[PDB]
């Protein structure tokens, strides 16, 4: 029933009450979130239904109503902003300089920000307002804090 652009909370109608499981990005008529948020289950946008279109467990990404539309990436130098939408709190931009996930296949940006597990899927933005990845898949480091990869898909 809605295809406007912006950031969205992903909610559930569970046993008794509602609960925010994650966050998503609606852009160009496609809803982008992380797989561990929806597990490939269809979503409701008012009176209209959003059916999964593409998904990958290893990438931990899922797109609804169309292919993955987000293609921007971190430049490896400038600061980014985590558009965190925590449960019960208004959307807030958290600026930070990403670290690096040095992997077998290359470097990936990573933000050392620790937020509730209902922020999963929150977009990470560059200086031009482009989504360079989603927040929610990462590691817990040697001390106990959380570091999220900047998880981006392919277009």
């Amino acid at each position: 029933g809605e295809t406007t652009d912006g950031v969205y909370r992903v909610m559930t109608r569970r046993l008794l009450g509602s609960t925010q499981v994650g966050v998503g990005v609606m852009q160009e008529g496609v809803f982008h979130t992380m797989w561990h948020v929806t597990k490939g289950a269809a979503l409701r946008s008012g009176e209209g239904r959003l059916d999964p279109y593409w998904g990958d467990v290893k990438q931990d990404l899922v797109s609804y109503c169309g292919p993955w539309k987000l293609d921007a990436a971190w430049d490896g130098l400038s600061e980014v902003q985590l558009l965190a939408v925590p449960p019960g709190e208004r959307a807030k931009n958290i600026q930070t300089l990403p670290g690096i996930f040095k992997t077998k296949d290359g470097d990936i940006g990573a933000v050392a920000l620790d937020y509730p597990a209902g922020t999963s899927g929150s977009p990470i933005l560059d200086k031009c307002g482009r989504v360079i990845g989603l927040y929610g898949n990462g590691v817990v480091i040697k001390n106990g804090s959380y570091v999220s990869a900047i998880t981006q898909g392919k277009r």
Binding site: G6, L83, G99, A112
Partner: protein, 38 residues
């Protein structure tokens, strides 16, 4: 039954709180999408 609700615009804020460090970590990604330190 899951559903979405709009939370705001996708915009860079000209006055955002800056926090968090920039750790460089050697990790590995397995077939199940899990990161692990090396």
């Amino acid at each position: 039954d899951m559903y979405i609700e709009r939370a705001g615009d996708i915009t860079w804020e000209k006055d955002a709180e800056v926090t968090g460090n920039s750790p460089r970590l050697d990790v590995a990604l397995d077939e199940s999408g899990d990161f692990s330190l090396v």
